[model samples]
Target chain A: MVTREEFVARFGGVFEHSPFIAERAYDAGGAGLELTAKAVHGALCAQFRVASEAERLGVLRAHPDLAGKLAIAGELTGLDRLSPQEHARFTQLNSAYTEKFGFPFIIAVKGLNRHDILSAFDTRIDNNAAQEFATATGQVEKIAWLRLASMLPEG
Target chain B: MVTREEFVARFGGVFEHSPFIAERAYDAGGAGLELTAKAVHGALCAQFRVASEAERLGVLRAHPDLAGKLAIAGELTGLDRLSPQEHARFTQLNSAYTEKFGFPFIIAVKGLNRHDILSAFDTRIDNNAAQEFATATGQVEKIAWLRLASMLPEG
Candidate 1:
């Protein structure tokens, strides 16, 4: 477990991105050091009480393309741990997905791999907006937890 | 609002395959409408936990390459979509980030487009894993929310 100050020192900036979540993190620390880090991580979700359907639709309007180009997936290349064949398969799947879907199929790939990601992209795009939206948001939550833990003090 | 039966018929399969979230959805008529939906969605998220540091590094191992790819902007492509030039730029940024990072730079892409995503990739790749992981998880949560809400009855 990490000390509060140390946890904060590493991840304090995480809260800085969204001021609303900072307090939940502080309050959570009271429960236990582990709980605090978890809470702080949990607070990173993008909660919405949209005023209209258009507003909701408008948000979806902004997703990036994911195929033969750049996407969050590209970030994984820095890890450079994947094999050439693994990389090639990823690109192929990405291209197929983009062709099927009009944009790069959107997904939050925090706890996934090239195989898992392509599986997800292929499985998910068939969904209508309602279902896809829920899945996408769920991915976002996972991404947040990953981020929070990332900043926690190294044991 | 979509009925329980209708919702299940439409998306039950989607939930079952979730690696991060255990499949645990039920029809939500008795618990009140919005409350039931929120409960189900929240519990699904409660199931989330980190995969581990080695898993984290490996997870990055599978991200897709981005750059020189076609992508839309943060705004709208509307009925029509990205021009070849915009896509060219998107691809360029995607590649540039890959050159710098090794992994496909990840983003939630909820409220962002090519430029925003590209610029973010450039900036965020400079961050260490501890910080980058946190941001990636946060994005995943938002993506999940997108899927969940899409399932709920629009009315």
Candidate 2:
């Protein structure tokens, strides 16, 4: 069995700026768990799902904006690069969505392209505030799962 | 039950740079253990003492040199400051001490002044490796205990 320190350090960031989720998961039977995507993700999400609504919102807010300024500034650009006009449009969209939902617009964005992300963002902005909050945090869970899978293989 | 994460986060640094010590202590029985210094200290040292000689050495080696360069560079000088000459003398002592002992000179510097630390360092340097190793690690345990006590009260 891996030590708690090992477990915490490994999975802590899986929840994106929220190690408390990983920390609680380890306490909640993660100590005996196999370090695989399926098993660990379930344990980690259980903690996230059970967290207070404020904390769930916190997790949603933790995500960086799609094609955020940091990504642009990385200087390492590709097809992932956005046209200046498109970039400005997305910035406005991001600000508007977050102003409404109280969190950054979040999506897994792993296989999806910028067009797909913009499409989702456009539609999601129409969601009721209550519904959108739930959806955004749900998307955060998917981002977390994908992040964990990239690190550890399936069980 | 205090989660393994809580126990580790709370006590991990008790063994200086070896949170593995706290990690194992939590795994061994810390989940069921109370947070009092008496109880936690015993559990932590149990793991520390039972550690492989190499691991124990690792723990001993983890301690910073008494009044080493970092404390000086922290700019943050206090009664702890030493003359450039005294600082250079101590630096030489640390290097020689590590050469002889295969680790930094380990001492809990809480209440000790430069004179007291220098006197102890001066005297202890004369001992054989066999005795000095034991003494250094034992002093480390004292450091850990005192640190834990500062964070927690007696049982």
Candidate 3:
């Protein structure tokens, strides 16, 4: 029974600094859904999935780089909490991955350990641009799902 | 007309210590197109399929020089260096790669070798999805790494 503004305000950040998905989904018949985690995540994903590549790329770029420039600048998230090795490892990988792919390497990092993240970075670096973009953006969607999961009910 | 060892020696580092790419290209059992800088680039990328899929995809999406969307974002390469037909060819290839792969097709023009650039464009078009995506991505890694080598080596 949440109002449109309340719903968007509640879940707008599920996609990491991207509330438009929530806003668009809510306006696009999403307000009528049951608004469970799965339902709401699906709704938001629908809008994001259909958006133009540029928008999708923006979403990918939206995620702060791990131990990247933003970390030094005191951006959101806790990249400042890493060990020196983690920082150096991620810094080098981040530079190579970003310079090569034009975006920061993205993974949900919620359920993953540092090693798991490093493995993904090593392997995903092998994919082609389109495939990687598709994979990363898909990862973005998964990130959205995880973020939304914590906010709403599991239904 | 470089021997396999000679070829590998010259262009092996072209892909950042992954001379296997260059070595494999010489042994892919074809060499007519590899006498020059660009043709060799085309050959190396084509042989880059030896890399894992994930790695290749990373390379494919890594470039910003297709002189299209990613290109414009950078004021984009000196695509102005190209003649009209050369420019048009780059355009067509960029469109084709994006349309097929969902990202820009990219490569390293080692030493700013335009001959290598256009030759790669013309030859790689005939590659199937798997071949071309793998080839294209491998080229991208080489490009970024090569450019990095330029600066990092100076350090």
Top model number, DockQ: 1
By DockQ, the better pick of 1 and 2 is 1
Candidate 2 lDDT tens digits, A89-144: 66567767878888778776655566787789878999998888778778877866
| Best candidate (score: lDDT) | 2
Model 2 TM-score is: 0.48
Top-scoring candidate (TM-score): 2
Query: Comparing candidate 1 with candidate 2, which one achieves the higher TM-score?
Result: 2
Error of 2 at B15 (Å): 35
Chain B TM-score, one value per candidate, order as shown: 0.55, 0.87, 0.48
Give per-residue lDDT, candidate 3, residue B22: 69
Cα error, residue A18 of model 3, in Å, equals 1.7
| Candidate 3 residue-wise lDDT, A49-154, digit = tens | 9989898888888765544222211211133344534554675687678778998888766545667878899899988899899898888887667654543455
Error of 1 at B26 (Å): 9.0
Model 1 residue runs over 4 Å out of place are A1-155, B1-20, B24-37, B50-80, B95-103, B153-155
Candidate 3 CA-lDDT value: 0.59
